Write a protein that binds this ligand. Structure first.
Ligand SMILES: [Mg+2]
Ligand SMILES: [Mg+2]
Ligand SMILES: [Zn+2]
Ligand SMILES: [Zn+2]
Lengths: 260, 1361
DNA sequence: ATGGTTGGGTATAATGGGAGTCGTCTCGGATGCAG
DNA sequence: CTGCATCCGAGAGCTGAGGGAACCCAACCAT
């Protein structure tokens, strides 16, 4: 009942994986499906994204609630197209279904990669969902002509997605990705210097070890801006009755003496 | 501005939430990390919530007033007061609906009752574990058709929605025993080692080899995993055409000539259950479309579907395959729950349950009634059930979840910000995933996480592991956590606040103060009365203006002398409130006139220490300053210390002499007794005088002269008046303790100068000689009880001002005479009697005997143990008697003896421990030791006795530690259940009454014995006589208030057999709504006069009951008994009572015992444990409700048997038993009020011609009014039975949702009130306190608060006009 | 005119996680048993 | 269809003072 991680893992396990034949088949179907989508777009003269939306609606079915009238109208506006030029539509439908099977079968790469990213301010489930987002991007952009396995192209996208999610959602005050990476470099340099020298390093040593463009003053500012707000309800004293926020005065509103 | 009169709470619609919000929060950003300004579309954006600065937009275009209502074009921020940042909300638009956890997890779930779903099913559906069926569309599951509101697991749905498509991996290089595309029945082998288990066609997947003929001869081609086969099975090929298309130009397989194609050694087989349809032209339905029977597929309609399923056009073989499936519509989560909720028709459901209410089954009727309760609440309130499902989630204003910069430059934030950030992140990710057409597993997981995030925001730590911030184990505090608990909003900021114009300091004895005065340090007074001091200094020439006065008073060294005189003039006539925590009764806060003193300590009058329960070993007290004229008038008239002299609980004096005062008065009022003469006989007084002069007889020896007893003191010293006697005392002729003859009030009194001096002190204090002579008891030493009686009589006879004067005079003279009395404590003053030694030896004798009687078999271990305990107990009692007899006979003025006898300090047990011996001690297991402590504290203990006594000391300490908390909890519950009871009218007009008995059944049922005088006083004093009484030729008329003298008169008449019970009015039979009346309550015990209309008697009663429980009551017995009685818990030592009348016939067998009660109509049986004890005898008659075993009676069974009155009397008597056991005086009125609140509800047995339901609990008054209207209209009256519920459940069932929500179980009360749309009418006191209004009690009562005042001149002028 | 910011890409293969709690009592629904 | 009868989960237990874990790459907007 509880512990949603176990439920998610069981649901993922209920889907079987693929073999090499299955993987190459699905990838080839996906490729011909996108090619057929582009061919149908050229044939009808419409914008590709709209026909893509129509195909997605048809695969997902009425179950997935863009409105029924438009998608139905254009669906029959494509049935008007003559034969021989119609196989493409069936190929696009098959390719969309193939994308669905490929994603469901390869979801396990997300958990396998993400299980070693816990403890960075994001829970496991958020990491996993962001990894599925990277997996969809990898699936859509995959080219099977290189004869490379899906895992090779998927892992890079998964790591990129997880790392971007860490940079964007790990802190209450949003700090840009480049500055988060800079803080990451500062922390790793500081811990390495501490390990080699055997004591807590000074700011000047870290700045010298970073290289040109880095002084002690900028290092202090960088450590300053990396600080995270504290909780107003931090328990003070032995008894559970005194909080930190209970000792914070208002300096904005005028006092009764000032108003008088 | 209209006055606020009611507060309504109801469910909020999505439209209401969207109208509240000033904009949608689309981003999880809080503030910018560079500029510390709110981020656009973030949680702090000024366009939504308002500007940070007053009348200034974000971009600075407008920085002045008059732009109210104008929104800056560049920044979008309105120009207005910044305070709007604590009022304006935002909202988040959920991609998918989410369920409000309050209506899901409060057992029983509201959604579960509405949708007739259990908690497990609701949890499974809401949290994405099972499907629920909507519009089944004629689907078949296991041969049974599926119906609405049916729960399917994932497996059944996948089978129904898609089908069965099993796959078998055939080993590489093995041919299959079947061909591609032929129907295979279950069990038909598809390979030498693979056997199918479902009916349907088998489909080849990646055949390993291909045999291609050529026009003939065959040829073989290997098919590698990296390549695919294009030509369909059984299709001819042409020359030059391709068969195995390849990625690499050299790897392509082009057919050389024309030949057929066959595929062998399939890598896998896919068996499905489906139908097949060939076509030779364009098709109409594409892959992923679902079709019905008789639909066009291809060939312009030549081919037609026969079954329901999903169509997929396999182009490789150019064949349409329809897999058998259905279009069933099953949805998950709060979206599905909302869809089910909107289809609900409440009127038809109400009719269905009304029909169900005719079932013979009682359990079915109860369940249907429970469903009808919620259904009718929804129908009456007008709320829609779908509003219990959230679509837009409101966002609290930022100023109530602040992100602030601490003084050290760091940032501090609320947990609500993190919860909102998590919710926003999950919502945005869900929107992105939905926009991408992600597979359904990812979407389901995303929806589950969004639901969990909403649950954490609403109630974190309720389902599953609570959400915590990384690096800590502390759960985040959700809005409910803010609302509820001991630290929540209601209990911490609404029922109690921190206040201005207040201080605190240590207290010091103030013996030179008057009764109405308190010593206040100069610095405290200067700080507390600062604005008044500034204004008064402005009046004088000390400062030109208030600012100059403030700067001058700012620095300590800048203060002068005249400012102190200005302060002294400021506080002239004003009073302050002194308070010592814990405040157990109303006397814990009292008003005093401040006298300015030096130093840092508050000076307290000695006579209020008992009322405050304050000592001088480090206690601190707080001081408050009432500001306005109304507050000062209330403090001076109703809260003055000198105006509160009697206890509100018992009516006995509470401000009375104590400790040293009694010691001094007793020392000066005690008379000497000597043994030198020892009853010698003298014939003429002159002989006695000569004998005394020679030195043969003592001055105060009780001699006999001429046949009458006297002393030499009486004959030798005859004084004309008290002045001469006191002058002789001043010259050392006689002492204050000598007995002489004095002429006073025209009589010759044989008394001592000390008693005459005491009489003169009292007479000069009360300024009345005759009344003072009447009040005092001359012929006894003055001790605690006599002084208390004197104070009470003086109050009654003269008034509180003269009583205060008398108290002050008594205090002063007691202190003065205690100073010079010569009271001291030395080690030799604890005289150990000689008899003790003998008493010990005798014990040491019997011990030996006992041992003999144990060594010869006459006694067992248990008997010997009991005999040792009995002997040592009797020895201890005998030692006590010997100690006190020795003290009285040899050392009548011993300090310990005087302290114990006068009541100043100490009890006989402590004196016995000091002198004789400590005695028996208890082990931690509760059983006594075998050896006693034979040493007193004077002799000095050994190590072993000290160690054994440590057990009892520690147990007493721990007992105290738990008792104080339990008594505080009980007091809070009583205050909360009785808080609404006020005296609201002069007379309710009732004719009901109660009969207080004067005789109680004897413990052996021999006869009725007269109750103790204290109990009769506590049950009769101050009450209103319900009926006329004739006793001893005295006619007590109806409506008379019973004073103490009348109570004594009735007790005397009862002792003469003229009366057995007294009929009196009581709150138990009062008919006033939401309170009592003046006549049914009686006296205000603190004034000995009829209670004033408007008094909050419920709070007084609750405090009065709760006060003694802390410490006074120790701990079936003690405080647990009181707690069990006030909560109406069924006792674990429950006894057996008779539900009906009859005669008793005890039937005992060698294995079992039973009692049969045989009436004239029916004969019932009672089976009871053999170990039990029976209070009955064979062949006696017992009434209904009489006990047949010893133990506590279950109140509900007594209510069923006898009725309400018997339970009322039982509860009152049993609650008073515990307090009387401890010696605590407490009037029956308070317990009677509490019991009246306890029995406030009834249960409907037959609704008759009303809209009520059977079994619906409701207030008695409402059903009585409904019955009255119904009989007036001529319908069938409702039939009801009384109910009894504990104080907690009675308090939680009140009409006012504010008080119930602030009491306990906040979520349940709030959800019920919101569903019902309850309106709070602000009848009680707590709601008005929460709203910051004037309570409907005291000066805020409607009876008195509209009074006007005017002089005669203005009244005459208005008359002329 | 200038830095700091914003989004996109990386190709051997990589495919179900991990932490854990114990010396409390009382009250009201919920489930399963005999009659 | 009653009645017992455990069986489990939920929600409480004095006040006050005081408590202190990647790198690169290249475009793009605010000011
Ligand atoms: Mg003390
Ligand atoms: Mg004389
Ligand atoms: Zn602006
Ligand atoms: Zn009345």
């Amino acid at each position: 009942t509880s512990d949603p991680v176990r439920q998610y893992l069981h649901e993922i396990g209920q889907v079987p994986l693929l073999t090499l034949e299955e993987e190459v088949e699905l990838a080839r179907k996906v490729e011909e499906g996108m090619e057929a989508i582009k061919k149908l777009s050229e044939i009808t003269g419409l914008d590709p994204d709209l026909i893509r939306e129509v195909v997605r609606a048809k695969i997902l079915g009425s179950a997935r609630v863009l409105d029924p009238k438009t998608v139905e109208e254009i669906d029959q506006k494509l049935k008007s197209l003559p034969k021989e030029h119609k196989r493409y539509l069936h190929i696009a439908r098959e390719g969309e279904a193939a994308r669905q099977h490929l994603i469901e079968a390869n979801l396990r790469l997300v958990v396998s990669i993400a299980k070693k990213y816990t403890g960075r301010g994001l829970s496991f489930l958020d990491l996993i969902q962001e990894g599925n987002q990277g997996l969809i991007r990898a699936v859509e952009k995959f080219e099977y002509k290189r004869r490379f396995k899906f895992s090779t192209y998927a892992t890079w996208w998964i790591r990129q997605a997880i790392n971007r999610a860490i940079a964007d959602q790990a802190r209450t005050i949003r700090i840009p990705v480049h500055m988060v990476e800079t803080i990451n470099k500062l922390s790793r340099t500081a811990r390495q210097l501490q390990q080699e020298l055997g004591r807590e390093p000074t700011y000047e040593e870290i700045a010298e070890a970073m290289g040109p463009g880095w002084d002690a003053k900028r290092v202090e500012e960088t450590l300053k801006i990396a600080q995270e707000p504290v909780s107003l309800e931090t328990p003070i004293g032995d008894e559970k009755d005194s909080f930190y926020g209970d000792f914070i005065p208002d300096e904005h509103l005028p006092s009764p003496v000032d108003a008088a | 501005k209209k006055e606020v009169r009611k507060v309504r709470i109801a469910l909020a619609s999505p439209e209401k939430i969207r109208s509240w919000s000033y904009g949608e929060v689309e981003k999880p950003e809080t503030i910018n990390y560079r500029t510390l300004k709110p981020e656009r579309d973030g949680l702090f954006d000024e366009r939504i919530f308002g500007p940070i600065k007053d009348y200034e937009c974000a971009c600075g275009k407008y920085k002045r007033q008059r732009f109210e209502g104008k929104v800056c074009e560049r920044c979008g921020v309105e120009v207005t007061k910044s305070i709007v940042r604590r009022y304006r909300m935002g909202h988040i638009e959920l991609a998918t609906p989410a369920a409000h956890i309050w209506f899901v997890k409060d057992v029983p779930s509201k959604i579960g009752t509405l949708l007739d779903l259990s908690a497990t099913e609701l949890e499974q559906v809401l949290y994405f574990s099972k499907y629920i069926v909507l519009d089944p569309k004629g689907a078949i599951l296991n041969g049974v058709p599926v119906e609405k509101r049916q729960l399917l697991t994932d497996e059944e749905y996948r089978e129904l929605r898609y089908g069965k498509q099993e796959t078998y991996p055939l080993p590489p290089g093995v041919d299959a025993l079947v061909k591609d595309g032929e129907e295979v029945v279950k069990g038909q082998e598809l390979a030498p080692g693979v056997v199918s288990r479902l009916d349907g066609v088998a489909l080849y997947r990646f055949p390993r080899r291909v045999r291609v003929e050529y026009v003939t001869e065959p040829k073989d081609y290997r098919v590698q995993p990296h390549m695919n086969v294009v030509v369909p099975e059984g299709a001819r090929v042409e020359a030059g055409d391709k068969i195995v298309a390849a990625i690499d130009p050299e790897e392509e397989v082009i057919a050389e000539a024309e030949g057929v194609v066959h595929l062998h050694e399939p890598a896998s087989i896919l068996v499905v259950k489906a139908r097949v349809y060939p076509f030779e032209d364009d098709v109409e339905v594409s892959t992923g479309d679902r079709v019905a029977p008789g639909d066009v597929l291809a060939d312009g309609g030549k081919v037609k579907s026969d079954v329901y399923g999903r169509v997929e056009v396999d182009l490789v073989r150019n064949v349409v395959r329809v897999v058998e499936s259905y279009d069933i519509d099953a949805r998950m989560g709060a979206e599905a729950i909302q869809q089910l909720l909107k289809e609900l028709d409440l009127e038809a459901l109400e009719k269905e349950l009304l029909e169900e209410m005719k079932h013979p089954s009682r359990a079915r009727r109860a369940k249907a009634r429970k469903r009808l309760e919620v259904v009718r609440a929804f129908l009456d309130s007008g709320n829609r059930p779908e509003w219990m499902i959230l679509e837009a989630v409101p966002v609290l204003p930022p100023d109530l979840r602040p992100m602030v910069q601490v003084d050290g430059g760091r940032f501090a934030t609320s947990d609500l910000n993190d919860l909102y950030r998590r919710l926003i992140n999950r919502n945005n990710r869900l929107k992105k995933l939905l926009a991408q057409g992600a597979p359904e597993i990812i979407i389901r997981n995303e929806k589950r996480m969004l639901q969990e995030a909403v649950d954490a925001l609403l109630d974190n730590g309720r389902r599953g592991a609570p959400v915590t911030n990384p690096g800590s184990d502390r759960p985040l505090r959700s809005l409910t956590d803010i609302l509820s608990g001991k630290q929540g909003r209601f209990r911490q900021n609404l029922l109690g606040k921190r206040v201005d114009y207040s201080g605190r300091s240590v207290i010091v004895v103030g013996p030179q103060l008057k009764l109405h005065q308190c010593g206040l340090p100069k610095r405290m007074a200067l700080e507390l009365f600062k604005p008044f001091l500034l204004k008064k200094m402005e009046e004088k020439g000390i400062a030109p203006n208030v600012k100059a006065a403030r700067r001058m008073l700012e620095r300590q060294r800048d203060i002068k002398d005249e400012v102190w005189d200005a302060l002294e003039e400021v506080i002239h006539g004003k009073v302050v409130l002194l308070n010592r925590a814990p405040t157990l009764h109303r006397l814990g806060i009292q008003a005093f006139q401040p006298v300015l003193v030096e130093g840092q300590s508050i000076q307290l009058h000695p006579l209020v220490c008992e009322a405050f329960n304050a000592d001088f070993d480090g206690d601190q007290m707080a001081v408050h300053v009432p500001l306005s004229s109304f507050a000062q008038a209330e403090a001076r008239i109703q809260m003055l210390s000198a105006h509160n002299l009697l206890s509100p609980a018992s009516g006995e004096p509470l401000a009375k002499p104590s400790r040293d005062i009694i010691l001094g008065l007793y020392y000066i009022t005690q008379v000497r007794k000597e043994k030198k003469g020892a009853g010698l006989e003298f014939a003429t007084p002159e002989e006695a005088l000569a004998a005394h002069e020679r030195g043969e007889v003592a001055l105060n020896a009780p001699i006999k002269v001429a046949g009458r007893e006297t002393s030499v003191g009486r004959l030798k010293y005859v004084f004309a008046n008290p002045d001469e006697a006191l002058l002789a005392v001043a010259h050392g002729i006689v002492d204050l303790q000598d007995v002489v003859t004095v002429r006073y009030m025209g009589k010759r009194l044989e008394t001592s100068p000390g008693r005459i001096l005491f009489a003169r002190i009292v007479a000069e204090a009360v300024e009345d000689e005759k009344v003072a002579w009447e009040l005092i008891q001359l012929d006894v030493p003055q001790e605690k009880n006599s002084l208390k009686d004197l104070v009470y009589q003086a109050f009654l006879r003269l008034g509180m001002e003269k009583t205060a004067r008398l108290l002050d005079a008594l205090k002063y003279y007691g202190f003065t005479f205690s100073t010079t009395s010569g009271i001291t404590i030395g080690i030799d003053d604890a005289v150990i009697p000689e008899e003790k030694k003998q008493y010990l030896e005798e014990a040491d004798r019997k011990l030996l005997q006992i041992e003999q009687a144990y060594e010869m078999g006459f006694l067992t271990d248990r008997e010997r143990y009991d005999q040792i305990l009995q002997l040592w107990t009797e020895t201890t009692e005998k030692v006590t008697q010997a100690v006190f007899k020795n003290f009285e006979e040899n050392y009548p003025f011993n300090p310990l003896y005087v302290m114990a006898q006068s009541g100043a300090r100490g009890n006989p047990q402590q004196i016995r421990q000091l002198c004789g011996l400590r005695g028996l001690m208890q082990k931690p297991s509760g059983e006594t030791f075998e050896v006693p402590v034979r040493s007193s504290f004077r002799e000095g203990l050994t190590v072993l006795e000290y160690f054994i006594s440590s057990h009892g000391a520690r147990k007493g300490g721990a007992d105290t530690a738990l008792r104080t908390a339990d008594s505080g909890y009980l007091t809070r519950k009583l205050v909360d259940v009785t808080h609404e009871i006020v005296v609201r009218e002069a007379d309710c007009g009732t004719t009901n009454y109660i009969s207080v008995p004067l005789f109680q059944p004897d413990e052996v049922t021999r006869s009725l014995r007269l109750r103790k005088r204290a109990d009769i006083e506590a049950g009769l004093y101050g009450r209103v006589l319900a009926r006329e009484v004739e006793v001893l030729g005295v006619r007590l008329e109806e409506g008379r208030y019973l004073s103490m003298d009348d109570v004594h008169l009735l007790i005397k008449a009862a002792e003469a057999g003229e009366i057995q019970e007294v009929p009196v009015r009581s709150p138990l039979t009062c008919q006033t709504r939401y309170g009592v009346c003046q006549k049914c309550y009686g006296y205000d015990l603190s004034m000995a006069r009829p209670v004033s209309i408007g008094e909050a008697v419920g709070i007084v009663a609750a405090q009065s009951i709760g006060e003694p429980g802390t410490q006074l009551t120790m701990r079936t017995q003690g405080l647990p008994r009181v707690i069990e009685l006030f909560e109406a818990r069924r006792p674990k030592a429950k006894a057996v009572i008779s539900e009906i009348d009859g005669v008793v016939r005890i039937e005992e067998t060698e294995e079992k015992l039973s009692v049969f009660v045989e009436s004239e109509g029916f004969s019932k049986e009672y089976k009871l444990p053999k170990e039990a004890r029976l209070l009955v005898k064979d062949g006696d008659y017992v009434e209904a409700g009489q006990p047949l075993t010893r133990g506590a009676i279950d109140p509900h069974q007594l209510l069923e048997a006898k009725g309400p009155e018997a339970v009322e009397r039982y509860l009152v008597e049993e609650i008073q038993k515990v307090y009387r056991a401890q010696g605590v005086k407490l009037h029956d009125k308070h317990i009677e009020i509490v019991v009246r609140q306890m029995m406030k509800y009834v249960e409907v047995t037959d609704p008759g011609d009303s809209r009520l339901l059977e079994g619906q609990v409701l207030e008695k008054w409402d059903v009585e009014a409904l019955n009255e209207r119904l009989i007036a209209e001529g319908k069938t009256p409702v039939a009801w039975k009384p109910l009894l519920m504990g104080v907690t459940k009675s308090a939680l069932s009140t009409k006012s949702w504010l008080s119930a929500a602030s009491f306990q179980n906040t979520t349940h009360v709030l959800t019920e009130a919101a569903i019902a749309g309850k309106k709070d009418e602000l009848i009680g006191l707590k709601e008005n306190v929460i709203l910051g209004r004037l309570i409907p009690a005291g000066t805020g009562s409607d009876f008195v608060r509209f009074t006007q005042v005017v002089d005669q001149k203005t009244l005459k002028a208005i008359e002329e006009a």
